[PDB]
Design a binder for this molecule. Structure first.
Ligand SMILES: NC(=O)c1ccc[n+]([C@@H]2O[C@H](COP(=O)([O-])OP(=O)(O)OC[C@H]3O[C@@H](n4cnc5c(N)ncnc54)[C@H](OP(=O)(O)O)[C@@H]3O)[C@@H](O)[C@H]2O)c1
Length: 303
């Protein structure tokens, strides 16, 4: 629909990558350049939805690539981003280690500026659009407290951490809100042949991830039967606007986690094409840059 469509490559074909495929297809200003996978994954049978899709091991085999959408594991992502920025390719990621965002942002900023590229990081569900809402609440009521309650949903960094433990064949870890920003964790574990529940319970409950947090552990026959990739996020702020107390704000979403996250990353890919070289979180970009359409028509429709 646009003259020269944006050519988007998907790096890593996991949960995020599969939904990102659909988001790129629906994007009227974008066309799929291809999917980049590990060589090991290239040797498994080709997924049925990737028929007619260029699936390679390096971005150089896909021709021109405007933006790379990084659907890779968290710890693997900054290094992959730096590599692609250095090739002059824009990068979108949903890096979700909050304490490392400032540092990672600086490192990507320097590489991006050196190669006339734009990196948008932490552009997912949380961090991402929830961060944008959170920041808007902040300046509407500067004094007060915001509570971010991550509703019942799967934590895939906690699930694989419970899987690496001695005695667990498979595991599902859930993040559960208990109010005022506090969270409870519940772990469903499929045990190995002949391991006892009582000990493996005490190795998860004393694992560094679940010692200072309230944690419940249950043994189940099939953890795969319990998996659903939906999640909820509820944010509350009670604050002061100017000098007037008791301003009340509530934001809630009930969404498919990877579907939404991939959509935000695709919308951010659109925004990346409109920025000066550098690295940005989502609160550093005009909201209109994430939207497709004529500027005046968007203002007429939304403002
Ligand atoms: N910001 C948010 O609100 C939020 C929410 C959800 C997810 N995320 C982020 O999104 C990331 C991906 O989540 P997911 O559910 O899609 O995970 P996933 O299903 O495990 O997908 C990981 C994919 O990355 C590739 N990969 C795995 N190991 C790799 C390695 N060592 N080196 C290079 N590539 C590797 C693999 O694809 P191939 O087989 O094709 O190589 C794999 O399919 C997470 O790490 C998380 O940080 C953020």
């Amino acid at each position: 629909r646009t003259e020269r469509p944006i050519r988007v490559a998907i790096i890593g074909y996991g949960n995020i990558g599969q939904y990102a495929l659909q988001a790129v297809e629906e994007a009227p200003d974008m066309e799929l350049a291809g999917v980049v996978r590990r060589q090991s994954s290239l040797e498994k049978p080709l997924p049925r939805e990737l028929h007619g899709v260029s699936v390679v091991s390096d971005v150089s085999a896909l021709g021109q690539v405007d933006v790379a959408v990084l659907c890779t594991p968290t710890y693997e992502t900054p290094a992959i981003a730096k590599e692609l920025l250095a090739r002059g390719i824009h990068t979108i990621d949903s890096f979700d280690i909050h304490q490392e965002i400032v540092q990672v942002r600086h490192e990507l900023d320097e590489v991006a500026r050196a190669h006339q590229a734009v990196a948008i990081l932490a552009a997912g569900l949380l961090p991402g659009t929830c961060s944008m809402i959170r920041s808007i609440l902040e300046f509407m009521a500067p004094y007060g407290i915001t509570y971010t309650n991550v509703g019942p949903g799967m934590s895939m960094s906690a699930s694989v951490a419970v899987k690496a433990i001695e005695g667990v064949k498979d595991a599902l870890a859930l993040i559960i809100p208990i109010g005022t920003g506090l969270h409870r964790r519940m772990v469903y574990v499929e045990l190995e042949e002949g391991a006892d529940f009582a000990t493996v319970k005490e190795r998860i409950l004393q694992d560094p991830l679940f010692v200072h947090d309230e944690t419940h552990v249950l043994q189940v026959d099939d953890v795969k039967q319990l998996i659903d990739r939906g999640i909820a996020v509820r944010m509350e702020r009670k604050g002061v606007s100017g000098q007037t107390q008791n301003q009340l704000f509530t934001y809630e979403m009930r969404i498919n986690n990877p579907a939404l996250t991939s959509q935000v990353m695709i919308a951010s890919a659109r925004a990346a094409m409109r920025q000066k070289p550098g690295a940005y979180t989502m609160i550093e970009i005009p909201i209109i840059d994430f939207l497709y359409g004529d500027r005046d028509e968007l203002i007429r429709r939304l403002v």
